[PDB]
């Protein structure tokens, strides 16, 4: 294969820049203390297990998906269902709220991303378009704007679409195994992608080719999320650890791993400033990791089943952690 | 406050209508039975036996590695497992897949029904020697009929030694690690969708009845 001279070159490229790491610098940084967060609300009313949720840009309306075939759009302030959409396929696996607020996308095991139109002049909600072309199960779709949606399927492929025509504009291929999650950058020109091969591939939207491939994990990667600066991203896996990678350095920086956690992270998201790193585990908890000293400084233990999704508002005022008990709490 | 009250009331007027629809949908979601039909290595089929709604969700448009999308099927009442007992060596792949479903972290509360298909083609498989049952399972050559359980009439003592050997081969997997509410229901079938839905309904009743007896701690 003649890739050995290319196998060693990046390995010494990571070693030549691995000087004075993040653990050595933040020895002088003061800690944050134990952070008491209590369940402010409890948005009960789902039937089956909540599998995904996404916050609005207005930080008031959150959409949630579950296996019963419903797509509720709650109001987080008043605990009121603004819409309840009857889905076609029951086994949905992700949901996304458009940054304009007009549309909501939800597609799962039926290999089809369905764009719903909540801004319909007629009150009844309806499917705007019905994307198709993927073969595997759909894992995570997110909205760029009201015209472009990039999704992640289980056939080792990410695809960038245009909604008005229903065509794959750009198909991102190069992964091995099922792609599990997705997270857009704040400039929305790049996005990282974690798959079931212990590698989180960073993609370019307007190109279709992997910019850099980061591999420091050792099991299936279940969730990913950018840093607010856009120069880094955390990554949760089934390894029961989180790893804060870096774009400009192309190596891992921290390793958020305690000794007692024998349970894979299913969801991970930063705070508004990125000082905290809220991660949703499989032991029914949400361990808040201080993302600069890698010491756990908080536990959100309200649920009695495993947390599926974990969203943080755009202004940093609340945290919603859905779970498999059909209950979606709103922490603070 | 009063200008904020009518918009709150209109939000309340939509919430009460949405809560009205969910109570009409909860009593039909909790009344239907979800299934799952996967083989040894159409997406939704709905039938009904004795006024009970069955939702046999059939996968098969997905890929082969199934460690991620089978976690969605933990709330399913029963996972229908159909094997190809005629085989190359599809039987060992069906056995190791059953070991991974039974000992899964999230599927250890979901029972599994078995449908040992390819039945009559196994009768000629033990005589031809293309894929012999002794070639992949040589312990069958010393294994005899386990008990005096009556087989189907019009059969040979060799072929009923074969298919009952496939039965407790799977019962060795299930009875070894019992922690949860899973129960293995083996059956001997030849073709699907002919009298087998009675065998699914009679066994899906026993999962619901054992679910309520577990709630009262009677079992």
């Amino acid at each position, epitope marked *: 294969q003649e890739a050995e001279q290319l196998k060693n070159q990046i390995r010494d490229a990571r070693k030549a820049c691995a000087d004075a790491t993040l653990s050595q610098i933040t020895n002088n940084i003061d800690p944050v203390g134990r952070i008491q967060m209590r369940t402010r609300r409890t948005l009960r009313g789902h039937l089956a297990k909540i599998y995904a949720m996404h916050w609005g840009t207005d930080s008031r309306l959150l959409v949630s998906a579950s296996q019963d075939g419903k797509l509720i759009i709650w109001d987080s302030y008043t605990t009121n269902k603004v819409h309840a959409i009857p889905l076609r396929s029951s086994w949905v696996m992700t949901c996304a709220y458009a940054p304009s607020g007009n549309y909501v996308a939800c597609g799962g095991l039926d290999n089809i991303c369905s764009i719903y139109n909540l801004k319909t002049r007629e009150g009844n909600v309806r499917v705007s378009r019905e994307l198709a072309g993927h073969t595997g199960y759909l894992s995570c779709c997110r909205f760029l704007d009201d015209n472009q949606i990039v999704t992640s399927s289980g056939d080792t492929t990410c695809a960038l679409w245009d909604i008005e025509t229903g065509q794959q504009t750009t198909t991102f291929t190069g992964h091995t195994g099922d792609v599990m999650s997705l997270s857009l950058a704040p400039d929305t020109r790049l996005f990282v992608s974690g798959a079931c091969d212990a590698s989180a591939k960073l993609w370019d939207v307007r190109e279709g080719m992997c910019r850099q491939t980061f591999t420091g994990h050792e099991s299936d990667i279940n969730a990913i999320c950018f840093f607010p600066n856009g120069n880094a991203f955390a990554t949760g896996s089934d390894d029961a650890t989180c790893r804060l990678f870096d774009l400009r350095a192309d190596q891992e920086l921290m390793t958020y791993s305690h000794d007692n956690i024998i349970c894979g992270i299913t969801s991970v998201s930063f705070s508004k400033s990125g000082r905290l790193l809220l991660a949703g585990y499989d032991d029914f908890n949400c361990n808040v990791w201080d993302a600069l000293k890698a010491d756990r400084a908080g536990v959100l233990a309200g649920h009695d089943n495993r947390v599926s999704c974990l969203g943080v508002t755009d202004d940093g005022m609340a945290v919603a952690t859905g779970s498999w008990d059909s209950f979606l709490k709103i922490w603070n | 406050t009063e200008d904020q009250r009518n918009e709150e009331k209109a939000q309340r007027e939509a919430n009460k209508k949405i809560e009205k629809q969910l109570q009409k949908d909860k009593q039909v979601y909790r009344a239907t039975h979800r299934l799952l039909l996967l083989g040894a290595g159409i997406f939704e089929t709905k039938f009904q036996v004795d006024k009970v709604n069955f939702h046999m969700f059939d996968v098969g448009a997905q890929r082969d590695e199934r460690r991620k999308w089978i976690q969605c099927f933990n709330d399913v009442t029963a996972i229908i497992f159909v094997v190809a007992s005629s085989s190359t060596n599809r039987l*060992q792949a069906a056995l190791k897949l059953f070991d991974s479903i039974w*000992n899964n972290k999230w599927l250890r509360d979901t029972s599994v029904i078995l449908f040992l298909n390819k039945q009559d083609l196994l009768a000629e498989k033990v005589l031809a020697g293309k894929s012999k049952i002794e070639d992949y399972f040589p312990e069958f050559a010393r294994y005899t009929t386990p008990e005096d359980a009556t087989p189907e009439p019009g059969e040979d003592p060799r072929v009923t030694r074969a298919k009952y050997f496939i039965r407790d081969e799977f019962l060795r997997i299930s009875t070894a690690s019992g922690d949860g509410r899973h129960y293995c229901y083996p059956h001997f079938t030849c073709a699907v969708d002919t009298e087998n839905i009675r065998r699914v309904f009679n066994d899906c009743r026993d999962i619901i009845q054992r679910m309520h007896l577990r709630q009262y701690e009677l079992l």
Partner: nanobody
Amino acid sequence: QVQLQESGGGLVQPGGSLRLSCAASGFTFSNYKMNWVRQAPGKGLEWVSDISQSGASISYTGSVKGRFTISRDNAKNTLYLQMNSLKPEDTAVYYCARCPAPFTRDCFDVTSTTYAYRGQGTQVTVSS
């Protein structure tokens, strides 16, 4: 980087013996099951054997039971399958295959697709 370097293999006369060494580097080796998956030429992938973390439930497929012994060393991060009394039907490429996740008792690694935690594969052959 999860990589499974495999050694051994080659041409061995039938009825003889051979030893394979799965050199695993890139993970905590004492936390996962480890399997051996073989691929006969022109046939699909077939599961051969498996071993636990320290080794307590060792199983084999029935065609090679009593002839192959799988052993692991959690201090050297190396997995050994000892071949003895070879048959011509054992002519296959043998893949070391870790299980998907840690501290678990359920693996899904017989897949024909590019499984991510499976080695490159070494080839064993029989002679006349």
